[PDB]
UniProtKB/Swiss-Prot annotation, chain A:
High levels in stomach, esophagus and lung; low level in the liver and kidney. This is Aldehyde dehydrogenase, dimeric NADP-preferring. The modification N6-acetyllysine is found at K177, K193. It comes from Homo sapiens (Human). The lineage of its organism: Eukaryota, Metazoa, Chordata, Craniata, Vertebrata. Transmembrane segments: none annotated. One of its GO terms (biological process) is xenobiotic metabolic process.
Length: 447, 452
């Protein structure tokens, strides 16, 4: 099959040793930099057609992070790839002890549709830097980006090492029968289980970046003007379609109306009176998802928004009040521009609420009280945490990005990408000279 | 059922919060120290009954490593558990950025039979140190150790947090239907696939310490006296039943006879002329494995040994020459005292031989040439590597132990155990005050574009 042949060619190119010199890896990273610069308008056009992004947010909410990762990895690669001496003991003073990093082989990256350039290419950057071949499977839901990447990746990168596999679910299923040395998947919790099951057939390690509902606790006595503008930015970027969007708010009933008012103020600042006319507001990816999200508004009290246009997949920025946690909007990841507010009567109740649910990819809290922030962190579990902001924690080189429990396993970004896509091999090198200190270990044992 | 109740109790005890304070964790680790001290003779008796170990090798080839791990983890725990600040950026210089470590919840450790104390309790030590409840499933093949641990663990450790599950494969299968937050398994490559498949049902992360045939390349130019003594020791300890035993030798035909002679010399020093009379030589774990290993001698050119006694499950230290790489002894992990020598014409042929096979848990090479060592490491892949010795690389606090490919995924020992059994949670904590620098990110976007 075309899929088997592409994987075979990637594996043969890897086994040849081509990717082992750092110079080769850096040439391919530099070719990706050239791709991003030269294909800027094409990338914008694809993101506009798939998701109703514009030239500014295509770059500053997505493509820029890929460029930043490439530049940082090129700079750090020689230090990261070096053998790393480790601590000795009195018995091993004359030995060399070190961790050797080496590629895994052929890595598969399965992209997702909501940031279809970042979530295909940013993982690829780390896997290239670690010396692997990298097979890419873009999501078919972001059809324009998928088509674009199939054309431009082989225009810039080695054609055997870094192939792009076209198609949808059947092609991904077929691809998952192939033998890889690591799989990174971004997507749903349910498909994560399918990926891990396929990986098990070849003992392939996985990095799974999955889902959940990221809570956003807002403390009673905090600056709501600052808080709600930050929350609205993260919730409504990309029309709500972000893995670490603040999915829902938990707050004391006494500040619910203040939160609604300040979110509304920020939304009008951001997108005007009619967000359908804002160049900065996105659209839902597909008709299925449009219908799903609109269904989540049914039965709810709409404090703002609540309307949609099926033909162009516009959903107005929507705020829901006094939401029943058992209702549908509170029983699935929303992934759209619908923000429910759930009342809780204390920090302790908020912590209980979060812990009774599955572990989220992100947890957010807004408070001016350092003790509240430390307590909530200490008593909950999530992939990552931001206090007093949203989104930003997954964009930083020094903070590995990943989930826990149902939100995933493993992590990447920065140095952690290099580690994730390598094998870290413990090495002990001893002199081949008689050593009296060793003879105690040989039989016969002493009486 | 019994299994479901033990896991339910462990999860409830974890949710109570009792494991979170470091004081509690250190108490449980100190209780394991006390168990090792007070149950010294019982542990030896169980290893003697299971594997024909004695009081010396029970301790110095197994129990001592658990003790050292406990002592090391107790002293380091507060540093390892602390929030870890990380590098800031100009845009985050006024924030706090750090990695917060927290327990996973309920960890399952599935032990194996060949080092039935170490490969149950050393992983448990790490999981306890990281604040988890830990369910233990000992292997039924080391029956005396399995029964002993079911008795003594609850005498020393918290009863609800740290239960021991009895039984064989049917009970392990039932246990794998329960929801855990991490599973560590030591055993075969084949069962590792079954474990990972069961883990996928709950998105449970796994550490799999699996199998393979660890090659041992001996350079033509090296000191064969020193090399063969070290090889013999690692190969024949525990009657060959070690996950990182040097499984087979690769060497130039010109040195095969000298290797045989020096292996024989060391074997005679270790165990006498008749190894069956040595208190230091072990026995095969079970009748099934006795028949399997004996089968691997059939059809082979025997240089030394080659016989066994089914009644005691003794297999003589055995060396095979001019071994066909396609023959049974070279097509499965031996896990017994049968050492095949396979001939290669060069280092390059040895590298190719190793690379055509699945990635082994350990790779060994004996050479006084630095370039040979560096080239073999650079051109192969294995879980870990030792040059000029065997076994020892997996006993050091500073060298994580684990496989790659078919020999496994993940690692543990020392700080790596604490990390493996924790979630490392990235945290950004910003002041809640207006910050003008943030406003660039908010829509509306600039209507005119500028250079990037
Ligand atoms: K309501
Ligand atoms: K001795
Ligand atoms: K620490
Ligand atoms: K602005």
């Amino acid at each position: 099959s075309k899929i088997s042949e592409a994987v075979k060619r990637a594996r043969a190119a890897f086994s040849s040793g081509r990717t082992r010199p750092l110079q080769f890896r850096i040439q391919q990273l530099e070719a990706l930099q050239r791709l991003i610069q030269e294909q800027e308008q094409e990338l914008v056009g694809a993101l506009a057609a798939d998701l109703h992004k514009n030239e500014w947010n295509a770059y500053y909410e997505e493509v820029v992070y890929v460029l930043e990762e490439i530049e940082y990895m090129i700079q750090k690669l020689p230090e990261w790839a070096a053998d790393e001496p480790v601590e000795k003991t009195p018995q091993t003073q004359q030995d060399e002890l070190y961790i050797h990093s080496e590629p895994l082989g052929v890595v598969l990256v399965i992209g997702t549709w909501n940031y279809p350039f970042n979530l295909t290419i940013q993982p690829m950057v780390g896997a290239i830097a670690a010396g692997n071949a990298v097979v890419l499977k873009p999501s078919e839901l972001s059809e324009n980006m998928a088509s674009l990447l199939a054309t431009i990746i082989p225009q810039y990168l080695d054609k055997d090492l870094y192939p792009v596999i076209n198609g949808g679910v059947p092609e991904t299923t077929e691809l998952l029968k192939e033998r890889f040395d690591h799989i990174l998947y971004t997507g749903s919790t349910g498909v994560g289980k399918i990926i891990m099951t396929a990986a098990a057939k070849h003992l392939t390690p996985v990095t799974l970046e999955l889902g959940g509902k990221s809570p956003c606790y807002v403390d009673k006595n905090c600056d709501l003007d600052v808080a709600c503008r930050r929350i609205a930015w993260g919730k409504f970027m990309n029309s709500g379609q972000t893995c670490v969007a603040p999915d829902y708010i938990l707050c004391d009933p006494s500040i619910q109306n203040q939160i609604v008012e300040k979110l509304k103020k920020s939304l009008k600042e951001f997108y005007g009176e009619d967000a359908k006319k804002s160049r900065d507001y996105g659209r839902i990816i597909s008709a299925r998802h449009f219908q799903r999200v609109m269904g989540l508004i049914e039965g709810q009290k709409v404090a703002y928004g609540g309307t949609g246009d099926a033909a162009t997949r516009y959903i107005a920025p929507t705020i829901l009040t006094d939401v029943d946690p058992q209702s549908p909007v509170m029983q699935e990841e929303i992934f759209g521009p619908v923000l429910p507010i759930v009342c809780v009567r204390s920090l302790e109740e908020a912590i209980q609420f979060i812990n009774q649910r599955e572990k989220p990819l992100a947890l957010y809290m807004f408070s001016s009280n350092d003790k509240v922030i430390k307590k909530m962190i200490a008593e909950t579990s999530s992939g990552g945490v931001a206090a007093n902001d949203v989104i930003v924690h997954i964009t930083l080189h020094s903070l590995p990005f990943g989930g826990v429990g149902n939100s995933g396993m493993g992590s990447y970004h920065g140095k952690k990408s290099f580690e994730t896509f390598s094998h870290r091999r413990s090495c002990l090198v001893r002199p081949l000279m008689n050593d009296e200190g060793l003879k105690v270990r040989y039989p016969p044992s002493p009486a």
